[PDB]
Amino acid sequence: SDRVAQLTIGNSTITTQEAANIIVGYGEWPSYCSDDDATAVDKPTRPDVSVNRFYTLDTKLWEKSSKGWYWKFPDVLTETGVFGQNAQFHYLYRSGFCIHVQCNASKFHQGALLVAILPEYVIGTVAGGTGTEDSHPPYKQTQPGADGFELQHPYVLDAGIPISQLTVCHHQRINLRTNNCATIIVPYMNTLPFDSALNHCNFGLLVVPISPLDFDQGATPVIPITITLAPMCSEFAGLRQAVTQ
Amino acid sequence: SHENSNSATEGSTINYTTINYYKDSYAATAGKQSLKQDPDKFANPVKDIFTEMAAPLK
Amino acid sequence: SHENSNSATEGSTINYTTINYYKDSYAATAGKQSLKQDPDKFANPVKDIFTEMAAPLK
Amino acid sequence: SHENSNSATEGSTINYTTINYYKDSYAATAGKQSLKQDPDKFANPVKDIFTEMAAPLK
Amino acid sequence: GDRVADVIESSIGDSVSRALTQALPAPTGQNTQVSSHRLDTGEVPALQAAEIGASSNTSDESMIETRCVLNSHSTAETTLDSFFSRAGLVGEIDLPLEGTTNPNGYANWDIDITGYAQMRRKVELFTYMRFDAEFTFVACTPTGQVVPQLLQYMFVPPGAPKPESRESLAWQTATNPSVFVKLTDPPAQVSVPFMSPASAYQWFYDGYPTFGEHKQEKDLEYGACPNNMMGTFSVRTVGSSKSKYPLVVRIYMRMKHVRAWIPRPMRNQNYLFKANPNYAGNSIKPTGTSRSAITTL
Amino acid sequence: GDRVADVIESSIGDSVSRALTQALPAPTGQNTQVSSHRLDTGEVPALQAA
Numbered sequence: 001s002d003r004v005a006q007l008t009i010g011n012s013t014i015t016t017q018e019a020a021n022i023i024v025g026y027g028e029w030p031s032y033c034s035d036d037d038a039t040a041v042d043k044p045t046r047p048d049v050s051v052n053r054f055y056t057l058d059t060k061l062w063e064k065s066s067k068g069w070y071w072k073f074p075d076v077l078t079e080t081g082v083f084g085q086n087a088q089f090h091y092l093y094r095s096g097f098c099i100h101v102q103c104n105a106s107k108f109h110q111g112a113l114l115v116a117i118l119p120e121y122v123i124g125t126v127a128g129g130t131g132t133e134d135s136h137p138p139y140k141q142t143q144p145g146a147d148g149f150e151l152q153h154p155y156v157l158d159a160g161i162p163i164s165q166l167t168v169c170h171h172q173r174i175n176l177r178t179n180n181c182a183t184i185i186v187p188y189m190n191t192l193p194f195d196s197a198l199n200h201c202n203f204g205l206l207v208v209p210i211s212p213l214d215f216d217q218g219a220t221p222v223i224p225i226t227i228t229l230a231p232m233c234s235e236f237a238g239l240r241q242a243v244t245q
Numbered sequence: 246s247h248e249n250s251n252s253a254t255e256g257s258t259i260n261y262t263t264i265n266y267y268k269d270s271y272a273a274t275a276g277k278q279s280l281k282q283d284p285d286k287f288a289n290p291v292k293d294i295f296t297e298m299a300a301p302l303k
Numbered sequence: 304s305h306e307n308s309n310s311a312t313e314g315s316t317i318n319y320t321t322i323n324y325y326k327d328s329y330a331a332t333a334g335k336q337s338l339k340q341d342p343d344k345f346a347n348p349v350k351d352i353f354t355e356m357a358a359p360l361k
Numbered sequence: 362s363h364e365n366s367n368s369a370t371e372g373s374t375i376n377y378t379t380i381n382y383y384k385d386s387y388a389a390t391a392g393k394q395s396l397k398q399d400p401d402k403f404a405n406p407v408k409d410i411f412t413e414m415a416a417p418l419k
Numbered sequence: 420g421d422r423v424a425d426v427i428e429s430s431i432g433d434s435v436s437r438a439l440t441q442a443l444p445a446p447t448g449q450n451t452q453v454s455s456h457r458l459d460t461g462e463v464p465a466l467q468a469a470e471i472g473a474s475s476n477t478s479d480e481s482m483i484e485t486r487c488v489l490n491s492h493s494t495a496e497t498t499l500d501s502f503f504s505r506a507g508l509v510g511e512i513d514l515p516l517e518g519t520t521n522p523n524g525y526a527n528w529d530i531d532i533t534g535y536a537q538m539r540r541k542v543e544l545f546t547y548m549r550f551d552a553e554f555t556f557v558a559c560t561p562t563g564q565v566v567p568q569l570l571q572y573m574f575v576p577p578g579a580p581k582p583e584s585r586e587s588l589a590w591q592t593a594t595n596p597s598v599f600v601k602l603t604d605p606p607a608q609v610s611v612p613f614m615s616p617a618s619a620y621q622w623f624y625d626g627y628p629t630f631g632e633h634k635q636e637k638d639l640e641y642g643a644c645p646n647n648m649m650g651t652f653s654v655r656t657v658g659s660s661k662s663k664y665p666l667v668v669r670i671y672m673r674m675k676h677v678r679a680w681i682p683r684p685m686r687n688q689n690y691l692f693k694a695n696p697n698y699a700g701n702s703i704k705p706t707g708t709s710r711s712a713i714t715t716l
Numbered sequence: 717g718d719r720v721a722d723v724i725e726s727s728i729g730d731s732v733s734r735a736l737t738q739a740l741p742a743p744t745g746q747n748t749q750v751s752s753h754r755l756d757t758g759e760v761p762a763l764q765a766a
C-alpha cells in the first residue's frame with residue numbers, strides 16, 4: 001500500500017515496487033499561471049500530452065571512486081522531442097517538473113545516494129587554485145547538456161556551499177538497503193511568471209554518493225544510475241524562428 | 246490616515262500595526278508581524294501523510 | 304482646520320488630501336492627486352466619432 | 362497603543378501608568394508604582410500568630 | 420461552447436495552487452502532555468525512514484515519560500523582520516586629496532550589498548528577497564575627525580549619464596533624488612522602496628543575460644542578473660575649486676517589510692569576488708574542527 | 717488536594733490486578749461442531765508461531 005507506486009502521465013508509465021514515497025516540492029503542485037500573475041498579452045500555447053511525458057536522459061556509472069554529477073534544468077531537454085522543439089521556437093516558458101532517479105542493486109550491495117534539487121545552482125570555479133585570477137566557468141561546464149558533469153570537489157558542491165546542509169532543499173535518498181528510486185515533484189520556482197528557456201536554468205539536480213558503494217568479488221561490478229524526468233503543466237508564449245542558443 | 250498603499254507587503258495574510266508620517270507606505274516602520282508558522286512545508290512535504298503512531302513502510 | 308483657501312488648485316474637479324500648519328493654503332504639501340485621464344482630447348479630437356469595427360472613409 | 366508586552370513586570374499585581382513611544386515595552390518610563398506593603402513577611406514570620414494583648418509563652 | 424468529452428471532463432487550465440499545507444498561528448512554543456509507560460505492539464513512534472525525505476515527527480511524549488509544562492517562550496525573535504532589521508556596512512567610498520584612486524573630488528559607487536562579507540552571508544541564506552531599505556551615510560575624515568564640509572549624495576538610476584567630473588552638468592539634479600548634508604549634523608537617512616522590475620531580488624541567477632555564441636571573451640557576464648543592477652551612487656565636494664579635507668563615506672543598510680523565498684545552504688568558505696561565488700582551490704577548509712580520534716573527545 | 721497535572725493525570729498507585737483472563741465454568745468437556753471441506757485463501761488455522 002506504500003512500497004509500490006505508479007506514475008502515469010502522458011503516454012508513459014513508471015512502475016516501481018521498491019519506492020519510498022512521492023515527495024512534493026514545497027507543498028505546492030505545478031499549475032498554470034493565473035490572470036493576476038500573467039504579464040504577456042498573447043495567448044499561451046499548451047501542448048497537453050505531447051510534452052508532459054517522461055524522458056529517459058542518460059545512464060551513468062556509479063563506480064567505487066565516484067564523486068557526483070549535476071544536471072541543469074531545463075537545459076537537458078532542448079534537443080529531445082516536441083519539448084526540445086518547442087523551447088527552440090518559443091521565447092517564454094513555464095513548467096514544473098517531476099524527477100525520478102532509478103538506481104538498483106541486489107541485497108548484497110551497500111551504499112547511499114543524495115538526490116537534491118538546488119534552485120539557481122550557480123557554478124563557481126577555483127579562481128586559479130590560489131584565488132588570484134578572476135576566472136569563470138566555460139560554457140561546457142555551466143550548461144553541460146544531457147550528459148551531466150562530474151563534480152571536482154563535491155564537499156563544497158563546486159559552488160562554495162557545504163554538502164552537509166544540502167537537505168534544507170528537496171532531498172530523497174537512494175539507499176540500496178531499502179529503496180531503489182527517488183521521486184521528486186518540483187513546482188515552478190522563479191521570480192517571473194514566464195522565463196526564457198535557452199539561457200536561464202531554473203534549478204540544478206545533484207546526485208552525490210554520500211555512503212560509498214561496496215561489494216565482494218563475484219557480484220557484477222557496474223551499477224548504473226538513470227535519470228527520468230517529465231515536465232508538468234508546460235506553457236509557451238511568443239513565436240519566432242528556430243535559434244539553437 | 247489618508248495615504249497611498251504601496252508598501253512591499255500589500256496583498257498578504259499578515260496584518261501590520263505601524264506608524265507613518267508621509268503619504269507613501271514604504272517609509273513606515275517595521276512594526277509587529279503576525280506569528281504564523283508552517284512546519285509542514287519544509288519538514289513533511291510528502292503526498293500521503295502518515296501518522297506518528299504507525300510505521301510508514303509496511 | 305480654519306484657514307484661508309488660496310492655493311493654486313481651488314475651483315477644480317481634483318480633490319486633495321494634504322497637511323498644512325499655517326493659515327494660507329499655498330504652503331501645504333503636494334499630496335495625492337486624483338487619477339482622472341482624458342485620452343479623447345489629444346488622440347481622437349474629431350467631430351464624428353467612428354467605431355473601431357468600421358473603416359472610416361467609405 | 363498597539364505594542365508588544367515584554368517588560369520586566371508583566372505578570373504581577375502592580376499596575377503601572379507609563380508613557381511609551383516604541384513598539385516594545387521595556388523602553389517605557391518608570392512610572393507610578395502601586396503602594397502595597399507586606400510587613401508580615403520579614404517581621405512576623407511565625408506559624409501561630411499571637412495577639413499583642415497576650416504574652417506569647419505561657 | 421464545448422461538445423467534446425475529453426475537454427469538458429478535463430483538467431487543463433488549473434490555475435489555483437493546490438497547497439497541502441495550511442499556516443496555523445503559533446505565538447509561543449508548544450506545550451508537553453503527560454505520558455505514561457507504554458509497552459504495546461505494532462505502534463512504534465521511534466522508527467522512521469529517512470529515505471522518504473521528510474524529517475522526524477517524534478514527539479517528546481512518545482519517547483520518554485514527560486511532565487505537563489505550560490510553555491510560554493515567545494517566538495517573536497526569529498521572524499524575518501527581527502532578523503534583518505539591523506543596519507550593517509555595505510559599502511565605503513573614498514575621497515582623498517593627492518592620489519590615484521579619486522583625485523578629482525568625486526567617486527562613483529555601483530549599488531550592490533555584496534561587497535562586505537558580514538552582510539553578504541546573511542542575505543545569501545535565501546535566494547529571493549523583497550525588501551525596502553533605510554540607507555545611512557556617515558561621513559568623516561580618515562582620522563575620525565569631523566570637519567565643516569558640505570557634501571552632495573546623488574542616486575543615479577540605471578540609464579542616466581554619469582558625471583565625468585565635479586563641475587559637470589549632471590549634478591544639477593533636476594529629477595534625480597539628491598541629499599545635501601554637511602558633516603556637523605546627524606547622518607543622512609533615506610528610505611528606498613522595492614525598485615526592481617522583477618517581483619523579487621535574487622542574489623543567485625544561474626544563466627546568461629544575452630544571446631549568441633558565448634566564447635572566452637563574453638564569459639564574465641555569467642551570473643550578472645540585470646534585475647539587481649540598481650544604478651550608481653555618486654558623491655562630490657560641493658564647489659568649484661579644490662577642497663582641503665579628506666573624506667570617507669560609509670553606507671549602512673537595514674531592511675524592512677522583508678519577505679523571503681526558497682532558502683538554501685549558507686556559505687562556509689571565504690569570499691573572493693563580488694557577485695561571484697569563487698573559492699580557494701587549494702585551501703578548502705572544513706566547516707567544523709578536528710580532533711585526534713572519534714572514540715574520545 | 718492536588719494542583720500539578722502530572723499527578724492528577726497519572727497512574728501511580730494502581731492496586732487492582734488487571735487480569736487478561738476470566739475463569740468460565742466448564743463442568744464437562746467441550747463438544748465438536750460439524751465442519752465441511754474448506755478450500756479458501758488467507759484463512760489458515762494450522763500455521764502458527766511457536
Ligand SMILES: CCCCCCCCCCCCC/C=C/[C@H](O)[C@H](N)CO
Nearest residue numbers: 530531532533574611621622647649694
Ligand atoms: C540617495 C539614494 C541612495 C541610494 C539608494 C540605492 C537603492 C538601491 C536598492 C538597494 C537594494 C539592494 C540591491 C541588491 C542587489 C545586489 O547587489 C545584487 N543582487 C548582487 O550584486
